[PDB]
């Protein structure tokens, strides 16, 4: 129908202009985070190496965070998008976390879930899993202080023995089209960084007390590192989907446009032939 196809050609054009809008705004936020991720890498290297060097050099394993223990029960931290329209950034991480418990788990009680992102909480509310902590509505530019208090809650749950082993599941930014579902073990610190270059350190702070400061500061540092990779990889995901979405829409506009032209030519010939057939009769 000529009226129906004209409306369709009009409808697609408007939505092509919106998908192009979203490509440009996501492109612009990517640069800031890509720059933010650079800027915090110098901070991340400074803190993580000095605290590792004092934790692993000139001393034994005498911290609950350093020492391995047999696992009575465990937890998972999974970080996901609040807003939708991102392509598979949310799914491929949920697929790995769900399979990892379902393939290896024999009790609901065995595992607990910490979640960042509305789509993660939604997936857990559908199907069925419990959630111990479920933070949401974070800004598009994440700050350290947002997860300062939320991390404080998580390290309290670990440090008091509620979970004996804890894993992070998040996306890692590698390339402009390729991004990698990654699994990390937040605690215990069964392994540690080693600069191999150390200097005399003050022996006045109690070693356990001195650690009491540096272990949580390392833990917060690791979690914040995952947020800079997670937000950089999201914006990128939205950008890729929007490019392909716009390219599919513009292709559909040329295919639809030809059907309209074919029809307009067709009707014109019909009306003329009915007119001339009656004129020939009379």
């Amino acid at each position: 129908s000529l009226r129906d196809i004209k409306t369709r050609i009009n409808a697609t054009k408007k939505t092509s202009q919106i998908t192009k809008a979203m490509e440009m705004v996501s492109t612009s936020k990517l640069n800031r985070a890509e720059q933010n991720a650079k800027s915090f890498v110098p901070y991340m290297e400074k803190i993580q190496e000095v605290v590792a060097n004092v934790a692993l050099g000139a001393g034994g394993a005498s911290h609950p965070m350093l020492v391995s223990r047999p696992v009575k029960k465990t937890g998972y931290l999974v970080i996901t998008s609040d807003r939708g329209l991102a392509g598979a950034y949310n799914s491929n991480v949920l697929r790995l976390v769900y399979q990892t418990i379902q393939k290896r788990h024999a009790c609901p009680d065995e595992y607990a879930i910490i979640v960042i992102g509305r789509v993660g909480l939604s997936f857990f509310r559908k199907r069925n899993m419990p959630v111990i902590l479920d933070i949401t509505r974070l800004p598009d530019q994440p700050s350290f202080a947002d997860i300062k208090e939320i991390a404080r809650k998580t390290v309290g749950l670990f440090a008091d023995g509620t979970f004996d082993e804890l894993y992070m599941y998040y996306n890692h930014y590698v390339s402009a089209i390729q991004q990698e579902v990654t699994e990390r073990k937040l605690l215990p610190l069964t392994d540690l960084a080693e600069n191999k270059q150390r200097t005399v350190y003050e022996f006045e702070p109690s070693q356990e007390e001195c650690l009491d400061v540096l272990l949580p500061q390392y833990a917060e540092s690791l979690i914040y590192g995952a947020l800079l990779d997670a937000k950089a990889s999201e914006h990128a995901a939205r950008m890729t989907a929007m490019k392909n979405a716009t390219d599919n829409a513009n292709e559909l506009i040329r295919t639809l446009t030809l059907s309209y032209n074919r029809a307009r030519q067709a009707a014109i010939t019909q009306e003329i032939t009915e007119i001339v057939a009656g004129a020939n009769a009379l």
Partner: protein
């Protein structure tokens, strides 16, 4: 006759403002049909909110619809129609559920019809 002099300034203001709301809802329905309603801004959400109510409140219970719809029927004087449509546009009655605006006469009735539903 929709000219300010032949109907008054208060009438004309409300009439053209309704016509902006319903033209904005028409273009926005294409975006909703393909991309989805949650994707859009607070001003775009508030347009769709009000346009649904305005469009259903244009429906009315007639006396010749006694045979077709059971309910008896209503006559709305012009002064009342302007008051009510102004309230919808200013948002006073937005708390009520949308299903109460169908086949009714005056805005007073819409408040009661909602009470039966339980709101």
């Amino acid at each position: 006759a929709l000219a300010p002099e032949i109907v008054g300034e208060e009438h004309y203001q409300v009439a053209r403002k309704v016509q902006q709301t319903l033209q904005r809802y028409k273009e926005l329905q294409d975006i909703i049909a393909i991309l989805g309603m949650d994707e859009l801004s607070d001003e775009d959400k508030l347009v769709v909110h009000r346009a649904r109510r305005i469009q259903f409140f244009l429906s009315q219970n007639f006396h010749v619809a006694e045979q077709f719809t059971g309910q008896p029927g209503s006559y709305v004087p012009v002064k009342e129609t302007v008051r009510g449509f102004k309230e919808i546009l200013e948002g006073k009655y937005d708390h009520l559920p949308e299903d109460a605006f169908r086949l009714v006469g005056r805005i007073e009735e819409v408040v009661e019809k909602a009470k039966a539903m339980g709101v």
